[PDB]
Amino acid sequence: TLDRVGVFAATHAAVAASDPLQARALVLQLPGLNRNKDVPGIVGLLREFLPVRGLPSGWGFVEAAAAMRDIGFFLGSLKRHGHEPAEVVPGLEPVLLDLARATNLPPRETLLHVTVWNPTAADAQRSYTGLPDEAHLLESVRISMAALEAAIALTVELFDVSLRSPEFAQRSDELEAYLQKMVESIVYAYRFISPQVFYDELRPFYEPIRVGGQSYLGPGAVEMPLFVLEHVLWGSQSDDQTYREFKETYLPYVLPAYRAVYARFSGEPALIDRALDEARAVGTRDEHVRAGLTALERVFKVLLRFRAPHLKLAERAYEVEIGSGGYAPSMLGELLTLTYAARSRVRAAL
Ligand code: HEM
Ligand SMILES: N[C@@H](Cc1c[nH]c2c(Cl)cccc12)C(=O)O
Ligand SMILES: [C-]#N
């Protein structure tokens, strides 16, 4: 049914299959060292595979992204025990900055590195803790990432489709079906991840580190390019400064292509602004306008079926401070309000 997912999943799998530093058996030893709080051991383990003589000249994006993944788990780990990795591992920061340059991404691990670029097998999957709850946390993102990426493409495509066309309702229906994967992610997370273990055992690994004289956030599903999708769909012309600062916070952490999608649509009417202007001009007597707006309302419905339960998941974990993305759960309440207001516009048009 979700035929667009496969190409995105295949692009991730290429990085997941890559082990340019031959580090697989080494990174598997990291969870034991974290459990023992063995900081010298963690450093010594990293230095067994950390390149010292620069990056191999044959490397492309895939090899450099894979290398950042493997070094990356050591970054959150070191910071988790109270140490700036750049300060306790000499020669590390030049390597991180070279890998940032090679990938056009930040100089540390991101969500992409620890989830979809990370192999799934028990004898290969990299992990901070090796805990079952961390395994399910990674899985919860793998459920929806490729489907979200397809949904971004569908949103960009829908932007150029007239509400007067039967194509509008059909593309919106298709978009809704990809966005349902976000809901599936949260259901999975609510069922399989203990909030207690998350807060006590996992969360400490997601603190910011300093590289290149600035601070970079640790991995979080907050880094998924959902905010780019909604920037195009409804948010691009919002004047809420807090919402704007939220989006611009994560921009460095998403694929270059999605930064470029974000830039293309900024300061310009969002999809629903255009769609509603068109509905106003043409009238809801037009059958394709009615169907298009109805299909559009269902898109907001699924966003809200993600966002509202996700808020409860987050509050439950913090019932045991701010996330890895740097916000308290109250920001989530604000984004949720914005989403209801956007759905409200669509439904008043009907
Ligand atoms: C134990 C599990 C989780 C907790 C405790 C949690 C908590 C949070 C927190 C505190 C934020 C605010 C930003 C920050 O400071 O990090 C956030 C944002 C966000 N998270 Fe999660 N989260 C969890 C799982 C997930 C999952 C499984 C997904 C999707 C697969 C997800 C997707 C998002 C998105 C898209 C945002 C941006 C805000 C929004 O779009 O509503 N999170 N989360
Ligand atoms: N940003 C949220 C949840 C979170 C941190 N790391 C994550 C990862 Cl690696 C996957 C999914 C969610 C999270 C928090 O820091 O509590
Ligand atoms: C959720 N990060």
mmCIF file with all atom_site columns, all heavy atoms in Angstrom, residues 261-275:
data_model
loop_
_atom_site.group_PDB
_atom_site.id
_atom_site.type_symbol
_atom_site.label_atom_id
_atom_site.label_alt_id
_atom_site.label_comp_id
_atom_site.label_asym_id
_atom_site.label_entity_id
_atom_site.label_seq_id
_atom_site.pdbx_PDB_ins_code
_atom_site.Cartn_x
_atom_site.Cartn_y
_atom_site.Cartn_z
_atom_site.occupancy
_atom_site.B_iso_or_equiv
_atom_site.pdbx_formal_charge
_atom_site.auth_seq_id
_atom_site.auth_comp_id
_atom_site.auth_asym_id
_atom_site.auth_atom_id
_atom_site.pdbx_PDB_model_num
ATOM 1   N N   . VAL A 1 261 ? 14.112 22.278 1.197  1.00 0.00 ? 261 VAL A N   1
ATOM 2   C CA  . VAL A 1 261 ? 12.641 22.345 1.145  1.00 0.00 ? 261 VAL A CA  1
ATOM 3   C C   . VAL A 1 261 ? 12.129 23.437 2.106  1.00 0.00 ? 261 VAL A C   1
ATOM 4   O O   . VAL A 1 261 ? 11.289 24.266 1.746  1.00 0.00 ? 261 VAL A O   1
ATOM 5   C CB  . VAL A 1 261 ? 11.978 20.985 1.475  1.00 0.00 ? 261 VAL A CB  1
ATOM 6   C CG1 . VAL A 1 261 ? 10.481 21.163 1.766  1.00 0.00 ? 261 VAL A CG1 1
ATOM 7   C CG2 . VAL A 1 261 ? 12.197 19.982 0.308  1.00 0.00 ? 261 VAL A CG2 1
ATOM 8   N N   . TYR A 1 262 ? 12.645 23.442 3.330  1.00 0.00 ? 262 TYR A N   1
ATOM 9   C CA  . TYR A 1 262 ? 12.252 24.454 4.308  1.00 0.00 ? 262 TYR A CA  1
ATOM 10  C C   . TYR A 1 262 ? 12.497 25.881 3.778  1.00 0.00 ? 262 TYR A C   1
ATOM 11  O O   . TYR A 1 262 ? 11.612 26.749 3.882  1.00 0.00 ? 262 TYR A O   1
ATOM 12  C CB  . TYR A 1 262 ? 13.000 24.229 5.626  1.00 0.00 ? 262 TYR A CB  1
ATOM 13  C CG  . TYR A 1 262 ? 12.581 25.165 6.744  1.00 0.00 ? 262 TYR A CG  1
ATOM 14  C CD1 . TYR A 1 262 ? 11.644 24.764 7.699  1.00 0.00 ? 262 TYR A CD1 1
ATOM 15  C CD2 . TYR A 1 262 ? 13.116 26.447 6.841  1.00 0.00 ? 262 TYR A CD2 1
ATOM 16  C CE1 . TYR A 1 262 ? 11.253 25.616 8.722  1.00 0.00 ? 262 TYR A CE1 1
ATOM 17  C CE2 . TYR A 1 262 ? 12.733 27.316 7.869  1.00 0.00 ? 262 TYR A CE2 1
ATOM 18  C CZ  . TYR A 1 262 ? 11.804 26.890 8.802  1.00 0.00 ? 262 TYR A CZ  1
ATOM 19  O OH  . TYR A 1 262 ? 11.426 27.738 9.813  1.00 0.00 ? 262 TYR A OH  1
ATOM 20  N N   . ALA A 1 263 ? 13.699 26.116 3.239  1.00 0.00 ? 263 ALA A N   1
ATOM 21  C CA  . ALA A 1 263 ? 14.082 27.426 2.708  1.00 0.00 ? 263 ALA A CA  1
ATOM 22  C C   . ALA A 1 263 ? 13.178 27.836 1.552  1.00 0.00 ? 263 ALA A C   1
ATOM 23  O O   . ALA A 1 263 ? 12.756 28.975 1.477  1.00 0.00 ? 263 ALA A O   1
ATOM 24  C CB  . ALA A 1 263 ? 15.553 27.442 2.278  1.00 0.00 ? 263 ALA A CB  1
ATOM 25  N N   . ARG A 1 264 ? 12.852 26.891 0.673  1.00 0.00 ? 264 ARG A N   1
ATOM 26  C CA  . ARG A 1 264 ? 12.014 27.176 -0.498 1.00 0.00 ? 264 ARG A CA  1
ATOM 27  C C   . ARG A 1 264 ? 10.627 27.727 -0.116 1.00 0.00 ? 264 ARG A C   1
ATOM 28  O O   . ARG A 1 264 ? 10.095 28.638 -0.764 1.00 0.00 ? 264 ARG A O   1
ATOM 29  C CB  . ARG A 1 264 ? 11.893 25.910 -1.336 1.00 0.00 ? 264 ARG A CB  1
ATOM 30  C CG  . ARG A 1 264 ? 11.025 25.994 -2.560 1.00 0.00 ? 264 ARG A CG  1
ATOM 31  C CD  . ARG A 1 264 ? 11.455 24.899 -3.534 1.00 0.00 ? 264 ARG A CD  1
ATOM 32  N NE  . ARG A 1 264 ? 10.339 24.325 -4.280 1.00 0.00 ? 264 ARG A NE  1
ATOM 33  C CZ  . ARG A 1 264 ? 10.011 23.031 -4.264 1.00 0.00 ? 264 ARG A CZ  1
ATOM 34  N NH1 . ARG A 1 264 ? 10.713 22.148 -3.519 1.00 0.00 ? 264 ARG A NH1 1
ATOM 35  N NH2 . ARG A 1 264 ? 8.975  22.617 -4.986 1.00 0.00 ? 264 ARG A NH2 1
ATOM 36  N N   . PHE A 1 265 ? 10.057 27.199 0.960  1.00 0.00 ? 265 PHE A N   1
ATOM 37  C CA  . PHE A 1 265 ? 8.681  27.560 1.333  1.00 0.00 ? 265 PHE A CA  1
ATOM 38  C C   . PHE A 1 265 ? 8.530  28.669 2.387  1.00 0.00 ? 265 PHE A C   1
ATOM 39  O O   . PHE A 1 265 ? 7.422  29.132 2.657  1.00 0.00 ? 265 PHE A O   1
ATOM 40  C CB  . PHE A 1 265 ? 7.902  26.287 1.698  1.00 0.00 ? 265 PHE A CB  1
ATOM 41  C CG  . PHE A 1 265 ? 7.656  25.385 0.521  1.00 0.00 ? 265 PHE A CG  1
ATOM 42  C CD1 . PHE A 1 265 ? 8.540  24.349 0.218  1.00 0.00 ? 265 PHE A CD1 1
ATOM 43  C CD2 . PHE A 1 265 ? 6.550  25.592 -0.315 1.00 0.00 ? 265 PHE A CD2 1
ATOM 44  C CE1 . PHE A 1 265 ? 8.324  23.528 -0.864 1.00 0.00 ? 265 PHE A CE1 1
ATOM 45  C CE2 . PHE A 1 265 ? 6.326  24.765 -1.419 1.00 0.00 ? 265 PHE A CE2 1
ATOM 46  C CZ  . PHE A 1 265 ? 7.216  23.729 -1.692 1.00 0.00 ? 265 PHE A CZ  1
ATOM 47  N N   . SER A 1 266 ? 9.641  29.115 2.961  1.00 0.00 ? 266 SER A N   1
ATOM 48  C CA  . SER A 1 266 ? 9.613  30.143 4.015  1.00 0.00 ? 266 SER A CA  1
ATOM 49  C C   . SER A 1 266 ? 9.152  31.509 3.521  1.00 0.00 ? 266 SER A C   1
ATOM 50  O O   . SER A 1 266 ? 9.464  31.888 2.402  1.00 0.00 ? 266 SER A O   1
ATOM 51  C CB  . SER A 1 266 ? 10.992 30.307 4.632  1.00 0.00 ? 266 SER A CB  1
ATOM 52  O OG  . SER A 1 266 ? 11.286 29.217 5.480  1.00 0.00 ? 266 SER A OG  1
ATOM 53  N N   . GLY A 1 267 ? 8.426  32.235 4.373  1.00 0.00 ? 267 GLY A N   1
ATOM 54  C CA  . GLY A 1 267 ? 7.960  33.599 4.083  1.00 0.00 ? 267 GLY A CA  1
ATOM 55  C C   . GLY A 1 267 ? 6.910  33.697 2.984  1.00 0.00 ? 267 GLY A C   1
ATOM 56  O O   . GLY A 1 267 ? 6.595  34.806 2.497  1.00 0.00 ? 267 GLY A O   1
ATOM 57  N N   . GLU A 1 268 ? 6.326  32.543 2.660  1.00 0.00 ? 268 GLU A N   1
ATOM 58  C CA  . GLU A 1 268 ? 5.427  32.355 1.525  1.00 0.00 ? 268 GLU A CA  1
ATOM 59  C C   . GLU A 1 268 ? 4.192  31.629 2.065  1.00 0.00 ? 268 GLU A C   1
ATOM 60  O O   . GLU A 1 268 ? 4.316  30.850 3.015  1.00 0.00 ? 268 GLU A O   1
ATOM 61  C CB  . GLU A 1 268 ? 6.142  31.477 0.496  1.00 0.00 ? 268 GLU A CB  1
ATOM 62  C CG  . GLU A 1 268 ? 5.711  31.618 -0.949 1.00 0.00 ? 268 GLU A CG  1
ATOM 63  C CD  . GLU A 1 268 ? 6.350  30.549 -1.832 1.00 0.00 ? 268 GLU A CD  1
ATOM 64  O OE1 . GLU A 1 268 ? 6.107  29.347 -1.586 1.00 0.00 ? 268 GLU A OE1 1
ATOM 65  O OE2 . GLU A 1 268 ? 7.094  30.913 -2.771 1.00 0.00 ? 268 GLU A OE2 1
ATOM 66  N N   . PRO A 1 269 ? 2.996  31.893 1.494  1.00 0.00 ? 269 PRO A N   1
ATOM 67  C CA  . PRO A 1 269 ? 1.799  31.197 1.994  1.00 0.00 ? 269 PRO A CA  1
ATOM 68  C C   . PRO A 1 269 ? 1.949  29.665 2.064  1.00 0.00 ? 269 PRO A C   1
ATOM 69  O O   . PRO A 1 269 ? 2.467  29.041 1.137  1.00 0.00 ? 269 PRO A O   1
ATOM 70  C CB  . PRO A 1 269 ? 0.715  31.589 0.989  1.00 0.00 ? 269 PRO A CB  1
ATOM 71  C CG  . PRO A 1 269 ? 1.141  32.931 0.497  1.00 0.00 ? 269 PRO A CG  1
ATOM 72  C CD  . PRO A 1 269 ? 2.648  32.915 0.481  1.00 0.00 ? 269 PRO A CD  1
ATOM 73  N N   . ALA A 1 270 ? 1.512  29.094 3.182  1.00 0.00 ? 270 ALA A N   1
ATOM 74  C CA  . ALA A 1 270 ? 1.527  27.657 3.374  1.00 0.00 ? 270 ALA A CA  1
ATOM 75  C C   . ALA A 1 270 ? 0.468  27.016 2.493  1.00 0.00 ? 270 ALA A C   1
ATOM 76  O O   . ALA A 1 270 ? -0.398 27.709 1.928  1.00 0.00 ? 270 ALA A O   1
ATOM 77  C CB  . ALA A 1 270 ? 1.302  27.319 4.824  1.00 0.00 ? 270 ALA A CB  1
ATOM 78  N N   . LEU A 1 271 ? 0.553  25.698 2.345  1.00 0.00 ? 271 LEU A N   1
ATOM 79  C CA  . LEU A 1 271 ? -0.367 24.972 1.484  1.00 0.00 ? 271 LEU A CA  1
ATOM 80  C C   . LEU A 1 271 ? -1.829 25.270 1.835  1.00 0.00 ? 271 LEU A C   1
ATOM 81  O O   . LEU A 1 271 ? -2.630 25.553 0.940  1.00 0.00 ? 271 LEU A O   1
ATOM 82  C CB  . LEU A 1 271 ? -0.114 23.470 1.545  1.00 0.00 ? 271 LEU A CB  1
ATOM 83  C CG  . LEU A 1 271 ? -0.684 22.600 0.415  1.00 0.00 ? 271 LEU A CG  1
ATOM 84  C CD1 . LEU A 1 271 ? 0.023  21.232 0.402  1.00 0.00 ? 271 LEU A CD1 1
ATOM 85  C CD2 . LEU A 1 271 ? -2.158 22.399 0.551  1.00 0.00 ? 271 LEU A CD2 1
ATOM 86  N N   . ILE A 1 272 ? -2.178 25.201 3.122  1.00 0.00 ? 272 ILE A N   1
ATOM 87  C CA  . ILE A 1 272 ? -3.563 25.384 3.488  1.00 0.00 ? 272 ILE A CA  1
ATOM 88  C C   . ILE A 1 272 ? -4.031 26.835 3.309  1.00 0.00 ? 272 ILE A C   1
ATOM 89  O O   . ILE A 1 272 ? -5.213 27.056 3.093  1.00 0.00 ? 272 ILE A O   1
ATOM 90  C CB  . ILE A 1 272 ? -3.918 24.808 4.895  1.00 0.00 ? 272 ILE A CB  1
ATOM 91  C CG1 . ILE A 1 272 ? -3.358 25.666 6.037  1.00 0.00 ? 272 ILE A CG1 1
ATOM 92  C CG2 . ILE A 1 272 ? -3.463 23.323 4.967  1.00 0.00 ? 272 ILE A CG2 1
ATOM 93  C CD1 . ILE A 1 272 ? -4.298 25.707 7.274  1.00 0.00 ? 272 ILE A CD1 1
ATOM 94  N N   . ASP A 1 273 ? -3.105 27.798 3.362  1.00 0.00 ? 273 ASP A N   1
ATOM 95  C CA  . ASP A 1 273 ? -3.447 29.207 3.110  1.00 0.00 ? 273 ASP A CA  1
ATOM 96  C C   . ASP A 1 273 ? -3.887 29.352 1.648  1.00 0.00 ? 273 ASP A C   1
ATOM 97  O O   . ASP A 1 273 ? -4.927 29.951 1.361  1.00 0.00 ? 273 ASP A O   1
ATOM 98  C CB  . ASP A 1 273 ? -2.273 30.159 3.408  1.00 0.00 ? 273 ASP A CB  1
ATOM 99  C CG  . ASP A 1 273 ? -1.770 30.058 4.848  1.00 0.00 ? 273 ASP A CG  1
ATOM 100 O OD1 . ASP A 1 273 ? -2.593 29.856 5.759  1.00 0.00 ? 273 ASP A OD1 1
ATOM 101 O OD2 . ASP A 1 273 ? -0.540 30.185 5.075  1.00 0.00 ? 273 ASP A OD2 1
ATOM 102 N N   . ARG A 1 274 ? -3.096 28.772 0.744  1.00 0.00 ? 274 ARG A N   1
ATOM 103 C CA  . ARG A 1 274 ? -3.413 28.744 -0.672 1.00 0.00 ? 274 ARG A CA  1
ATOM 104 C C   . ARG A 1 274 ? -4.718 27.989 -0.941 1.00 0.00 ? 274 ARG A C   1
ATOM 105 O O   . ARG A 1 274 ? -5.596 28.497 -1.652 1.00 0.00 ? 274 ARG A O   1
ATOM 106 C CB  . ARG A 1 274 ? -2.258 28.156 -1.488 1.00 0.00 ? 274 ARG A CB  1
ATOM 107 C CG  . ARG A 1 274 ? -2.441 28.300 -3.013 1.00 0.00 ? 274 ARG A CG  1
ATOM 108 C CD  . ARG A 1 274 ? -3.274 27.160 -3.648 1.00 0.00 ? 274 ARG A CD  1
ATOM 109 N NE  . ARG A 1 274 ? -2.560 25.882 -3.561 1.00 0.00 ? 274 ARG A NE  1
ATOM 110 C CZ  . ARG A 1 274 ? -3.110 24.687 -3.771 1.00 0.00 ? 274 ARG A CZ  1
ATOM 111 N NH1 . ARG A 1 274 ? -4.399 24.592 -4.085 1.00 0.00 ? 274 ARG A NH1 1
ATOM 112 N NH2 . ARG A 1 274 ? -2.364 23.591 -3.654 1.00 0.00 ? 274 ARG A NH2 1
ATOM 113 N N   . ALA A 1 275 ? -4.828 26.786 -0.377 1.00 0.00 ? 275 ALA A N   1
ATOM 114 C CA  . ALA A 1 275 ? -6.012 25.947 -0.535 1.00 0.00 ? 275 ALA A CA  1
ATOM 115 C C   . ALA A 1 275 ? -7.278 26.665 -0.079 1.00 0.00 ? 275 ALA A C   1
ATOM 116 O O   . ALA A 1 275 ? -8.289 26.628 -0.772 1.00 0.00 ? 275 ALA A O   1
ATOM 117 C CB  . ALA A 1 275 ? -5.857 24.626 0.217  1.00 0.00 ? 275 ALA A CB  1
#
